């Protein structure tokens, strides 16, 4: 018959869209200052017969999280003390003590001329530094990067401890969540739910391994932006934790001086007791099981009859060639060798593992040119317990001309850490208006 246009409003149709999401949380550097109280029990509606496509590599939510984190880090340093007066001749000598030693010269005993509350007077002080914190002028020393940037002291009252952050949609928008398992972050998701907000995600800063993240539901999941391109990082999510115990055994003390009328500076004082190298302990047997699971899953993509090898990074900056921690307010760099030293031919390698670590007080967390922060030293012995929840691997081969392939730890790009948690979420815009042919007529 004669079909007619009809109009419906409230129609359950959505489109791909990008919009700002807002944070929620349950002193501290993190977002909780900008955030609002959370929904203690976010609602989830399961949708049957929905096959909505997800693509984590294009997900805008990653960029929003990144920008919030950069702004927060900087915001916490705005009221804090400037250390510009510290760029001085800084003469130093060897620390002599009861030591197990380290690289020679790792600790230095330095003395220098500082300003006082009155500009009319100067004072002489001494302090201990790590070799990484200083460079030779030509003995005479200079604080590292005095030739590149101003250094700001972190405020001692501000914790760096992570706070879980939830993101919530604005009105007219909804967040879809993939419920599938063994999902590689792309393609159609067979089961989809709708949520007002995301699960809480802790900010974590680390390299080569992922800490305090979510676990895979059943089996280890391997994904990458382009598996055929060796340049791309491969992310591996574990279905089990591996516990790691890290420590800073030295009994450091903290001393302070007033600089100028408006500020004060904290520095490392005499160290009490034997001086020992920082280190981390992991179970060998647990790690061995973990590698066996990763290798088995790699073969599913790279095929059978391959030899899988692991090796340490061949070179590049200390910031990316080593594992990084921020714990206790101290920054650790660890070699990781002995975790990644193996060859797997016969589904087997052809107590604890102790890794060496180093401490640096002057850092640049986001790798920005012209920026620097000085952490104040933390008094007493520091112990940290955390769990490894994933790995970042790279191919140093791309080999097609052999039966072998070798993997090395990746790093230097923070976006890959956040992608491991946000891959399940997609943002869509709701469009309530639509039309249909159903017959009807109106009087005029």
């Amino acid at each position: 018959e004669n079909l007619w246009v009809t109009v419906y409003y409230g129609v359950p149709v959505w489109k791909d869209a990008e919009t700002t999401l807002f944070c929620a949380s349950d002193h501290n550097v993190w977002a909780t200052h900008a955030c609002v109280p959370t929904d203690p029990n976010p609602q989830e509606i399961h949708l049957e017969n929905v096959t909505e496509e997800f693509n984590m590599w294009k997900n805008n939510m990653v960029e929003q999280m990144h920008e919030d984190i950069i702004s927060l880090w900087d915001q916490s340093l705005k009221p804090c003390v400037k250390l510009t007066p510290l760029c001085v001749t800084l003469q130093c000598t060897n620390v002599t003590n009861n030591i197990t030693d380290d690289m020679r010269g790792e600790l230095k005993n330095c003395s220098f001329n500082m300003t006082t509350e009155l500009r009319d007077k100067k004072q002489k002080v001494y302090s201990l530094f790590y070799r990484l914190d200083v460079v030779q002028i030509n003995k005479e020393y200079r604080l590292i990067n005095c030739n590149t940037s101003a250094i700001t002291q972190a405020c001692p009252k501000v914790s760096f401890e992570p706070i879980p952050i939830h993101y919530c949609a604005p009105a007219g928008f909804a967040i879809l969540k993939c419920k599938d398992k063994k999902f590689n972050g792309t393609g159609p998701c067979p089961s989809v739910s709708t949520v007002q907000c995301t699960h809480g995600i802790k900010p974590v800063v680390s390299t080569q391994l992922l800490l305090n993240g979510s676990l895979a539901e059943e089996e280890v999941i391997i994904r990458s932006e382009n598996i055929t391109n060796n340049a791309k990082n491969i992310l591996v999510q574990l279905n089990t934790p591996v516990q790691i115990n890290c420590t800073r055994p030295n009994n450091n003390t903290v001393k302070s001086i007033r600089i100028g009328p408006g500020q004060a500076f904290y520095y490392t004082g005499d160290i009490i007791g034997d001086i020992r190298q920082a280190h981390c302990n992991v179970s060998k047997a647990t790690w061995n099981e973990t590698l066996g699971k990763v290798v088995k899953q790699l073969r599913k993509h790279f095929g059978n009859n391959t030899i899988i090898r692991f090796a340490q990074s061949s070179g590049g900056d200390l910031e990316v060639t080593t594992h990084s921690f921020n714990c206790g307010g101290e920054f650790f760099y660890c070699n990781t060798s002995g975790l990644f030293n193996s060859t797997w031919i016969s589904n087997t390698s052809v107590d604890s593992i102790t890794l060496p670590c180093r401490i640096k007080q002057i850092i640049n967390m986001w790798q920005r040119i012209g920026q620097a922060m000085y952490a104040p030293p933390i008094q007493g012995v520091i112990r940290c317990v955390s769990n490894i929840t994933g790995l970042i691997l790279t191919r140093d081969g791309g080999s097609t001309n052999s039966t072998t392939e070798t993997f090395r730890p990746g790093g230097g790009d923070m976006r890959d850490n956040w992608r491991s948690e946000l891959y399940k979420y997609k943002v869509v815009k709701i469009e309530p208006l639509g039309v249909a042919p159903t017959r009807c007529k109106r009087r005029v």
């Epitope: 073969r299 095929g303 016969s346 001309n401």
Partner: antibody
């Protein structure tokens, strides 16, 4: 139970062309690796072709004796492997087999199909 | 290519005696401390069956009488006791590199 079945063999005039096929069964073709070999009493066993998986960009390798006259390709969605050949010579006469690498690390032809006769004249 | 030499071309062995077949690669087959030499057994009308892998490991389903040996560029297959069921062509293979190579197949017979 892993099985391979060859087809497409038979007598072909020299300088001509033909396609051989192998049907995979009992395993996922997409996650393994495939190889072709040939045999004649005149020469014994000879390896002729290999095909890689997607991360390897489906790269292929050929023996110098067959290179440029033979080509290997696969269809992961149909569980099949194909060996294309042209510019055939009498020297190519022999029994062709679809094979599997088997044991990991210790690459070896652990599984073979029945094979098929190819004759060139 | 890496050339394999295999000998004897043929041998006749009485039942209950040990048979040996040698194989000598032009280049070492070894890698990562492990040999990559393989051996096959074949009977007429049938595809070859993997006999030995990694120069020492019997293939699955292979009888104890078949033993691999050697390292570097010197390998051999040792069969004992000889039985009529063992009459077959035998081949050595180098799996270490592409192209993989075969050659010099040997005929083993009952005396």
């Amino acid at each position: 139970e892993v099985k391979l079945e060859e087809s497409g063999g038979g007598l072909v005039q020299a300088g001509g062309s033909m396609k051989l096929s192998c049907v995979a069964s009992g395993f996922s073709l997409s996650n393994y690796w495939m190889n072709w070999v040939r045999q004649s009493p005149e020469k014994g066993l000879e390896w002729v072709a290999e095909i890689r998986l997607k991360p390897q960009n489906y790269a292929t390798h050929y023996a110098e004796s067959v290179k440029g006259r033979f080509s290997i390709s696969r269809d992961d969605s149909r569980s099949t492997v194909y060996l294309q050949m042209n510019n055939l010579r009498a020297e190519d006469t022999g029994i062709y087999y679809c094979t599997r690498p088997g044991y990991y690390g210790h690459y070896a032809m652990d599984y073979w199909g029945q094979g098929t006769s190819v004759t060139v004249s | 290519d890496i050339v394999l030499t295999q000998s004897p071309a043929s041998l006749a062995v009485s039942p209950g005696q040990r048979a040996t077949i040698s194989c000598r690669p032009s280049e070492s087959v070894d890698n990562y401390g492990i040999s990559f030499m393989n051996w096959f057994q074949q009977k007429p009308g049938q595809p070859p069956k993997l006999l030995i892998y990694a120069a020492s490991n019997r293939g699955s389903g292979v009888p104890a009488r078949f033993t691999g040996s050697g390292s570097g560029t010197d390998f051999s297959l040792n069969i004992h006791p000889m039985e009529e069921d063992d009459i077959a062509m035998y081949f050595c293979q180098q799996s270490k590199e592409v192209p993989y190579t075969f050659g010099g197949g040997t005929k083993l017979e009952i005396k």
